[PDB]
């Protein structure tokens, strides 16, 4: 197999490691000279970083030698390939950083592209050093429910980049915690789509963007630093949306987007229709193309569900060097009020509404439940438009008794609030 001792790896300037860790595989990395980034986040010299169950590049800004250990890797198959599209990301950031200091308020960029083109990675890198160079707090807006970032899956989010991201996490970092940690956690703004993929409820997804946009505006109006800073909006692939791209128009208007980044080549006809479709609103001067990034590998479904699984655990228990202690509470059937969104394979159409849910072992076991701020007695119009407090896992639906075992993120009472069921399941 591999080996459980350290190995030296001299990684040439301008090159990526490119790593694909799978089940259980644990990679510890320690730098003793040079400059290395993971999507822009620098690695501190002389301390141990640990990686689990995700594919990621380690980039060499400078000369760089490091020590690594992993039983699932060997010197034989190591992969060290020179990245060329890196400079594209550089003079795209300083392009944004010029807008930040010259304009009255910072740029609001959508990163739009095909399936696995580098959107999220590009989003992360641009955040990663909007902060590194002149201390901005760009607002990062994740609009892809399948991608868990700072939260659990199945929800769009807005998160300001306070300081450094966690380099050793596919989820960028994590939400605030009860004490103080060696990394400054983030305060996210979550909305909860709740469903597997966008096409399951089109209007509800846009309704999410609607109310997320509103809140984003209210902070931008009140926070000088975030408003002065940029705003980086990551979208799902256009193979998840309509041909005419009706959704993008709605993203652009509700989130006040003024600049668009299209990860596109110059034989791809997507570039042309982007110009004719969004040029009228943004102006062709404000639409940019980026030749697709090096090293961006295909991602299958199993890996993606794995990453979603990791995040759910991560929300309740944290990571290796975080270790959060969530709370398990016994609760009656009457102690809960639960709704669920309209599907395609449930409601045929799929409109902005939620149906009351009867408690069935097949309905709630291992289900992630979104907890709102609205009352237990509120009507559906109030619940569909009330902010999300946090999430809860249901362990056991005992049906012979009227009882439930719910895992909470906070040690305390079951928040007597209205709750929405998701399509997301987690069993330990």
């Amino acid at each position: 197999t591999g080996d459980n001792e350290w190995h030296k790896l001299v990684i040439p300037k301008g090159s990526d490691w490119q790593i694909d860790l799978k089940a259980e595989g644990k990679l510890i990395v320690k730098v003793n000279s040079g400059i290395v980034e993971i999507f822009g986040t620098e690695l501190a010299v002389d301390d141990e970083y640990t990686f689990q169950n995700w594919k990621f590049p380690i980039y060499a800004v400078e000369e760089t030698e490091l020590l690594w250990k992993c039983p699932d890797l060997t010197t034989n198959t190591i992969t060290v390939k020179p990245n060329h599209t890196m400079k594209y990301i550089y003079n795209l950031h300083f392009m944004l950083e010029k807008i930040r200091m010259s304009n009255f308020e910072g740029p609001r960029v959508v990163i739009v592209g095909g399936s696995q083109t580098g959107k999220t990675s590009l989003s992360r890198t641009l955040c990663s050093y909007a902060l590194k160079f002149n201390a901005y707090q760009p607002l990062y807006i994740n609009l892809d429910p399948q991608q868990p970032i700072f939260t659990v899956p199945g929800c769009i989010s807005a998160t300001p980049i306070s300081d450094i991201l966690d380099a050793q996490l596919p989820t960028w970092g994590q939400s605030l915690t009860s004490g103080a940690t060696l990394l400054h956690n983030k305060q996210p703004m979550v909305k909860n789509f709740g469903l597997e993929r966008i096409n399951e409820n089109k209007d509800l997804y846009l309704e999410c963007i609607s109310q997320l946009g509103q809140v984003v505006g209210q902070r931008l109006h009140l926070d000088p630093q975030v408003r002065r800073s940029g705003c980086i909006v990551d979208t799902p692939s256009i193979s998840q949306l309509d041909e005419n791209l009706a959704e993008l128009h709605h993203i652009i208007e509700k989130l006040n987007v003024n600049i668009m980044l299209v990860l596109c080549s110059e034989t791809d006809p997507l570039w042309e229709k982007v110009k004719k479709t969004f040029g009228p609103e943004l102006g062709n001067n404000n639409i940019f193309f980026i030749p697709k990034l090096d090293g961006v590998s295909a991602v299958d479904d199993v890996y993606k569900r794995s990453l979603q699984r990791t995040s759910i655990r991560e929300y309740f228990y944290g990571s290796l060097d975080t270790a959060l202690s969530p709370y398990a509470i016994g609760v009656d059937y009457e102690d809960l009020t639960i709704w669920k969104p309209s599907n395609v394979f449930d409601n045929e159409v799929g409109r902005v509404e939620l149906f009351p849910v009867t408690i069935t072992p097949s309905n709630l076991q291992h289900a992630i439940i979104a907890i709102t701020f609205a009352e237990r007695r509120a009507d559906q119009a109030t619940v569909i438009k009330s902010p999300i407090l946090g999430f809860a896992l249901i362990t056991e639906v005992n049906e012979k008794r009227r009882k439930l075992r719910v895992l909470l993120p906070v040690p305390g009472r079951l928040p007597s609030k209205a709750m929405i069921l998701t399509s997301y399941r987690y069993l330990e």
């Binding site: 300081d163 915690t177 929300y315 993120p409």
Partner: peptide
């Protein structure tokens, strides 16, 4: 021994400054 926190409400997040975290 620590735990995850609840998120802030809509208005409450809008007023929030990340300098409190730092």
């Amino acid at each position: 021994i620590q735990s995850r926190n609840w998120y802030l409400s809509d208005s409450q997040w809008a007023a929030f400054k990340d300098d409190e975290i730092t």
